[PDB]
Structure 1
Amino acid sequence: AAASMSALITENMHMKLYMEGTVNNHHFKCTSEGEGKPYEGTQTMRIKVVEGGPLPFAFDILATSFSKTFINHTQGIPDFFKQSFPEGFTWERVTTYEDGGVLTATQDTSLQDGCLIYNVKIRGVNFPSNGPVMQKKTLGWEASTEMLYPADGGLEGRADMALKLVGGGHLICNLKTTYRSKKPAKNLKMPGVYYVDRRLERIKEADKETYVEQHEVAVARYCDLPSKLAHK
């Protein structure tokens, strides 16, 4: 398995992305391209809003929809995402904001001629017309920890994220995600419960957020604290 993974997921990898969707009633399309180091868990994406720009909502709500192959899996945690190749995997997610916005996203991840290919679809509804997202009072995301746990041959994830607001303070949201491998389960080594620490940062933006550069670093670990019961 390691042999396959090292053949397909190189130390350096490029990605190409297409995104289409609606937020409230506003349609849009985005494309991006980027590169990263899958085993070190770092990556950059350069993103263009190619239709429906400038967006009437804060770009921040799209941030998590632009890359699971780029997680540094430490401590021998089996890598569900890198193992999934060459077949690939999908994810599906609902992000629920505490002021009512709901953003669903589904995504397909494939490997084509040594390049990672993302196809993303977005449908967000009920964002308050006079709230911080629609009025663009946001300033990016705090760091987060996602808990991943095996469920039915795939993985699920849970995270709470804090969106920084102008004037200080935060708007909180919750992420519920299902990660599904296209590789047959017999061929997968499933991890137990683990945690992915992340810091996703906006590096550059231009033209009323119709061009955005994002960088992410992601490191997977167990809980490092000692266990009285001998658990990981």
Structure 2
Amino acid sequence: TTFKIESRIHGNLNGEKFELVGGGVGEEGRLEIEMKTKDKPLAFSPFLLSHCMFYHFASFPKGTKNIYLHAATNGGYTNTRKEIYEDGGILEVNFRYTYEFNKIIGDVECIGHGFPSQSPIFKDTIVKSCPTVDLMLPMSGNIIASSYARAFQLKDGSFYTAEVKNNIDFKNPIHESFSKSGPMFTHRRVEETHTKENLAMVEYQQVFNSAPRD
């Protein structure tokens, strides 16, 4: 099961517009994607776009169907994210998808504002995005509210953090196998190799609903 991935990220950060285009491939639990800026290099850290660069590619626990792929087969879904950084920077991202045979095309609108001049995203001191574990809650109206804190590791070993919320809006009922009585979690991690002109990343996602050990 290997789908082709296509994406375009557009928007602006602190008033300056940017645009990236690219793609890659995804399978159960892993995706790889490479994107390039158009017209000019990025005016801020490329690591801020790593999470902007497809929930469809997470592996699910036995017994629970992949709700994102299931939705893609009917109506689909959108995801709206808001990241509130500890220094006041706010990143708002809206994910919309279109599907073709064996291919998912993402349209990502990203608006960043309120990042101070001293922010790590301008000092270019971020070296990697740390892993996260998302709490997903099925809610009335075919919505899933997702929440988690995240951190970027900086050159000196310290972290730059944000509190993140996602509103996943499904056109149709979320697959019944996805228990709506309790929450499920998604562990996510990425491997990044970026420059201000060419971004590259591999991402691993795993949905789970029980402790790792016994």
Change in CA separation of 1:34 and 1:191 when aligned onto 2, cut-off 3 Å? farther
Structure 1: which amino acid aligns with 2:188?
R
Moved over 3 A (4+): none
User: 1:222 aligned to 204, 209, 212, which one?
Assistant: 209
Q: Does 1:42 align with 2:30?
A: yes
Q: How many residues align?
A: 209
Q: Does 1:105 align with 2:93?
A: yes
Structure 1: which amino acid aligns with 2:170?
S
State the Cα distance separating 1:82 from its structure 2 match. 1.3
RMSD: 1.7
The within-5 A match list for 1:44-63 is 44-51=32-39, 53-63=40-50
Structure 1, gaps ≥5 residues long: 1-10, 228-232
Deviations 1:58-82 (A, max 9, x none): 1111111111100000132332211
TM-score (norm 1): 0.85
TM-score (norm 2): 0.92
Range moving further from structure 2, 57-66 or 190-199: 190-199
Matched-pair contact (CA < 8 Å) for 2:189–2:204: yes
Matched-pair contact (CA < 8 Å) for 1:75–1:222: no
Matched-pair contact (CA < 8 Å) for 2:151–2:161: yes
Q: Does 1:12 align with 2:2?
A: yes
Match of 1:26 in 2: 16
Q: Following the alignment from structure 2 to structure 1, what is the Cα–Cα distance between the partners of residues 199 and 42?
A: 12
The within-5 A match list for 1:176-187 is 176-182=165-171, 184-185=172-173
Match of 1:149 in 2: 137
User: 1:78 aligned to 57, 65, 71, which one?
Assistant: 65
Q: Following the alignment from structure 2 to structure 1, what is the Cα–Cα distance between the partners of residues 196 and 32?
A: 16
SS at 2:120's partner residue? coil
Change in CA separation of 1:136 and 1:226 when aligned onto 2, cut-off 3 Å? closer
Match of 2:157 in 1: 168
Structure 2: which amino acid aligns with 1:16?
E
Structure 2, gaps ≥5 residues long: none
State the Cα distance separating 1:19 from its structure 2 match. 1.4
Match of 2:198 in 1: 211
State the Cα distance separating 1:32 from its structure 2 match. 1.4
Residue identity over aligned pairs, in percent, reads: 19
**Which of the pair has more CA radius of gyration?**
1
